[model samples]
Target: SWRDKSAKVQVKESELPSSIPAQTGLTFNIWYNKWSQGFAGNTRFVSPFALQPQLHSGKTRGDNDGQLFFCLFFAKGMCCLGPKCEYLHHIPDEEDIGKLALRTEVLDCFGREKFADYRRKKNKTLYVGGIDGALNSKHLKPAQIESRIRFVFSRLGDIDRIRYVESKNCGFVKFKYQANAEFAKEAMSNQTLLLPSDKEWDDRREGTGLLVKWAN
Candidate 1:
């Protein structure tokens, strides 16, 4: 009877709209269905300026297997299964440094393995593409563009430098630490850019998703 009750509950929860706003101000709607073994719905561009990692600090799943892996969907603000999910639901804190260090260098927390190519292994820079300007007609100034790039990415980790090539409509984000670069690659990949001005305008914020990858 309890199993049936849980099934009924799941049906109601699934009927709810996927797009939901997080306390950080970013919106996410994606869901990873463990039963179906597939991803459903979608998520929106995450704004770095709106990110508040402190909110998730000290929150963790206690009954975990001691591996203590963070939930990728939760980081994107879209862990729909919540308590029923198997992965940890909190952000990595100072106490997790040891857990992080023990993780495989090539595989991220989500179990997505890195490219086995030679250059990719040691690179600390992310190549960001699809930046020809916002969908709106207002052209962003060069300085503004750089700042916008910095604004979105600097939240993930310490940046060594950011080089935006206007001619190619792409940029390179170099991180001071290799670990940060690896983490940023997973978080920022396929997410769109959100400028400070576009915060209020929902339509302008979606624009185009950024192509994030390791620089050769």
Candidate 2:
């Protein structure tokens, strides 16, 4: 929650242009090789903002977590997973304790506006997953679930992989982190998206929507 979850920067309403063209004079500005220590009222650590000699670019995927080249939200390059995140996978070193993937506000706007922009070039790579609640319930159908996944990607602008399980009533819609995946999750969670394959239902426009969170 310390990630300023409620703060959002809407670029769609602005006139700064949707996104920077593939290659131009536009250079991405981001923090490189940054990390933080544990959080507490009175705690001690070796360094607060130690900058490692590493940079992520939208051009390649990191060897550790599948995050994109640069920090999706801040546009700065990072060394490893930073804090401000509740869920983290492999810790390359002890430094990456609290840094988050990227801020939600910038990502919220950056992605929603141009989810389908094919020429979108990124400096970093990231992985994303969604919750699909159609496996356990008797009423939920497999085909219907697939349709929903497609719906969310269409809404967010892109999608890559999908996992359908038998139990847990939840599935994951995966995507590479070119932008803030959380923005896509926030956008889909409460919205009503109708799919072409949902005609069997009385109201075909009903969908569980997208829920983006950490912890696969």
Candidate 3:
């Protein structure tokens, strides 16, 4: 039956009113039903069922899977979006769908005044020194700390954005590119840095970058 005709409208992502970021991508889906019959997006309990061979087992109408299919179809179909997060749907036509706002992958909470432009920073120095209790001490000058930071995270593209923060004996280091940040995060997490016992600073702030899930 699917080969004979299509029931649902396959809305093109670009056809919708949504706008995606230049560096990002998107996808769209139109569900056959909404939510529970009593809830916000619900419809009639007796709504018609159509066999989607592409997704469900291709059993036709009046078959054993009809009513059962409607239950699973409506309940589950409305909740799945693959990698490219879907914008919005459930409209009469592509034009009816409202604008969809997407979020950028950039991480926030890092200081702005300290590093005004993440990508513009050429090379910076970051000092990680909590173990020795010299984190806020005046013994080590900012310039001295900056020089070493510039050397360690040199692989970073936008050298300006690189920064350092003490972590007890732990620390945080980052890069502008998600890939490069990930590389540093991964390459450094849970590792030890070589330093003499009489060294000026603690070198334990090393680990593979945070494996934190890339949230939408």
Candidate 4:
């Protein structure tokens, strides 16, 4: 609800360059890091503004149940499981919780938007299940299994991160764009995805009918 008046310099929008390449310059802006708040309420700037991190005070809205803003990480691409996630997961048409503002606004923490693509939809993360044990068994390298999934999913869109949970025989795939993830979900639905064949297996088989869906 407040901006720390004494963190660092604030760059006016006009001061920024007219254009920037997709992957250029420094990996990060120290100014953004220094000026941005790691967590809400760490410093309170008076009269400024607020959200999710507001107190009912004497003017309780009666609608203050703590969840008000959509999770930035979830919107930006990474999967967010509801209820268990620290940030909000609901999308509002207009009325409240405006939207997930990653750049600058209430609850705009830096790490939350590390890989988020704000230009699109929410729920960029997808849960990929129905992985066959043989396809990801101890006999196979994790990278081998990952490459298989990545190749299939990447066909749908640009992937930001692919994490295969060997123990669960499932993984979470995050896309650079929310639309891409959605496309992948629909494309791979009820379809069998293939992996490299294992020489150890006599059948020489490798594939799984993946269960793709938006992660909680």
For candidate 3, write residues 121-159 as lDDT tens digits: 322223333312322232444455554445444432234
Whole-model Cα lDDT per candidate? Answer: 0.54, 0.32, 0.27, 0.44
Kindly list the per-residue Cα lDDT of model 2 for residues 1-216, writing each as its tens digit.
212221122222232223333211234221111111222212221121111112212122232444322233322111233332112212112122113334332332322333334322432222222233211122546677656656555444345666655355445655545343433443333223333344533332222323344333
Question: Please, what are the lDDT tens digits per residue for candidate 1 over residues 1-216?
Answer: 111121111123454345443322233223222221232324323332222333432233322456455555545444455455555544444455456658667655444444553333457898987765342334677787788788777866678999999888889999876656766665665455654456434654445446688887
Best by lDDT: 1
lDDT of 4 by residue, 68-127 (tens): 433332332222232344333322322332333333342222222323445334667889
lDDT of 1 at 178: 64
TM-score of 4: 0.38
How does candidate 1 score on lDDT?
0.54
Which regions of candidate 2 fall more than 4 Å away from where they truly are?
Answer: 1-138, 192-210
> How many pairs in model 2 have backbone atoms within 3 A of each other, for residues 3 or more apart or on separate chains, i.e. clashes?
27
Best by TM-score: 1
Per-residue lDDT, model 4, residue 167, is 81
RMSD of each: 9.7, 18.3, 21.3, 18.0
Candidate 3 vs. true structure, TM-score = 0.25
Poorly placed runs, candidate 4 (over 4 Å): 1-121, 133-139, 195-208
TM-score of each: 0.61, 0.32, 0.25, 0.38
